[PDB]
Design a protein around this ligand. Structure first.
Ligand SMILES: OC[C@H]1O[C@@H](O[C@H]2[C@H](O)[C@@H](O)[C@H](O)O[C@@H]2CO)[C@H](O)[C@@H](O)[C@@H]1O
Ligand SMILES: [Ca+2]
Ligand code: NI
Ligand SMILES: [Zn+2]
Length: 431
């Protein structure tokens, strides 16, 4: 299409988070009348109020790594493209989605050296299909980070999210903002004290934490101006590196498990070093010609959550373009966004509730609104999951609209985090 309504897409992408809110206040100021209080006793098994936060995807478990990553990317979006939110009247809602995240992180940090990061057990949770408001029983506070149990990546992403909130909220409620920064400082300290990836069962198996520590450290520098954080960052981003001169050539993109590119981007801005500019340029060059492109024009990184990847890489490029105007990057980013919005061989918006001909069988329990009963869960979702970015098509641009095909129909917090950011960027550069 010649013109695209990026403004409305942004509004919807932010609204999506309401669908996954968890806790007794889940229905407060929620745009979906079909969402209400749920899992209201989370944490009782350990004597700590762990209610709040968000259901991870189409399920109801609260996984620490993707929860932290999502809050950090949403915070980054508002920080870099604030004007996009102000001019479209979405700043208020955005700040509300962010605080729902941070309130949960603060409650999960009862003391300076403790952080609970997973509520629920994935295997058992997935055997259930119904409304989260009706899923009774005490959920286990399965994982916790402390001096003897490492979770550097989870702790760092959560830390980054809290620092970004301090930066985005200090002109509204400076007291709350500082509570976030204090917590961010402590979670970061925990992460570098005992180094190791956190636990996420078979669902979120982590492989790196040096990327996360560096990322969290750059934000702490921005907030405090204490250069010791940058000294940490430069050392952590090279942990485990076995390459020549510590060369960083990431053939992937920004995602819950890999934050080497965003970390490199910030270090490039803060230190001006060539090593980081090279890393960023390699990843951008790699996506330009090495990443598979479908006949329809979509950059296809892998089979699961393919659009989540395209949007995430595009957001990084747009942040980069603010100080480094690169038309090749603006063109690639715009094509991926417009593809998601409807410019594709399937002639469908990949954002539910936006555009036309969207996914009617989302793999989302609350929106589906049915049970496993007579396989009713196979019927078209009862409610409109406004703003949800679905997994996407195959490398042939074909989309299979079926709840059983998780690869195509599931949605998740990490999916939409990058979408909000890329849309905020599209508004700034393309109007
Ligand atoms: O882990 C993939 C996917 O599983 C979904 O649950 C499945 C479960 O894996 C399968 O054994 C059972 O037969 O069906 C359920 C429902 O389709 C889960 O809902 C997703 O969150 C998860 O991504
Ligand atoms: Ca990582
Ligand atoms: Ni178009
Ligand atoms: Zn819940």
């Amino acid at each position: 299409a010649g013109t695209h309504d990026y403004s409305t897409a942004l509004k919807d992408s932010i609204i999506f988070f309401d669908a996954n809110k968890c806790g007794p206040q889940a229905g407060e100021n929620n745009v979906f009348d079909w969402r209400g209080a749920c899992h209201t006793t989370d944490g009782s098994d350990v004597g700590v109020d762990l209610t709040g936060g968000y259901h991870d995807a189409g399920d109801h478990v609260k996984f620490g790594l993707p929860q932290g990553y999502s809050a950090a990317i949403l915070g980054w979006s508002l920080y870099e493209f604030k004007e996009s939110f102000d001019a479209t009247g979405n700043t208020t809602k955005m700040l509300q989605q962010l605080k729902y995240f941070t309130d949960y992180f603060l409650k999960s940090h009862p003391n300076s050296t403790t952080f609970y990061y997973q509520v629920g057990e994935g295997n058992a949770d997935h055997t259930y299909w119904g409304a989260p408001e009706e899923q009774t029983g005490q959920r286990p506070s399965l994982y916790k980070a402390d001096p003897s149990s490492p979770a550097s990546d989870i702790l760092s992403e959560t830390s980054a999210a809290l620092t970004l909130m301090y930066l985005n909220y200090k002109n509204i409620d400076s007291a709350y903002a500082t509570k976030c920064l204090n917590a961010a400082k402590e979670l970061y300290a925990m992460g570098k004290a005992n180094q190791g990836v956190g636990n996420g069962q078979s669902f979120y198996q982590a492989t790196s934490f040096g990327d996360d520590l560096a990322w969290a450290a750059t934000w702490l520098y921005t907030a405090t101006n204490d250069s010791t954080y940058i000294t940490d960052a430069e050392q952590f981003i090279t942990l485990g590196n076995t390459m020549n001169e510590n060369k960083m050539q990431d053939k992937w993109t920004m995602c819950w498990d890999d934050m080497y590119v965003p970390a490199a981007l910030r270090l490039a801005q803060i230190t001006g070093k060539q090593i980081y500019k090279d890393a960023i340029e390699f990843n951008f060059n790699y996506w330009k010609t090495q990443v598979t492109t479908t006949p329809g024009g979509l950059k296809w990184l892998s089979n699961w959550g393919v659009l989540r990847y395209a949007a995430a890489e595009s957001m990084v490029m747009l942040v980069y373009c603010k100080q480094n105007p690169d038309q090749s990057l603006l063109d690639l980013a715009k094509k991926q966004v417009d593809y998601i919005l409807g410019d594709n061989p399937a002639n469908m918006s990949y954002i539910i509730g936006y555009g036309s001909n969207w996914c009617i069988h989302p793999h989302h329990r609350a929106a589906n609104g049915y049970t496993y009963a007579n396989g009713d869960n196979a019927k078209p979702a009862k409610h409109l999951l406004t703003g949800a970015l679905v997994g996407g098509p195959d490398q042939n641009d074909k989309f299979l609209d079926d709840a059983n095909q998780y690869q195509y129909t599931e949605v998740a917090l990490d999916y939409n985090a990058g979408l909000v950011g890329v849309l905020a960027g599209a508004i700034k550069f393309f109007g």
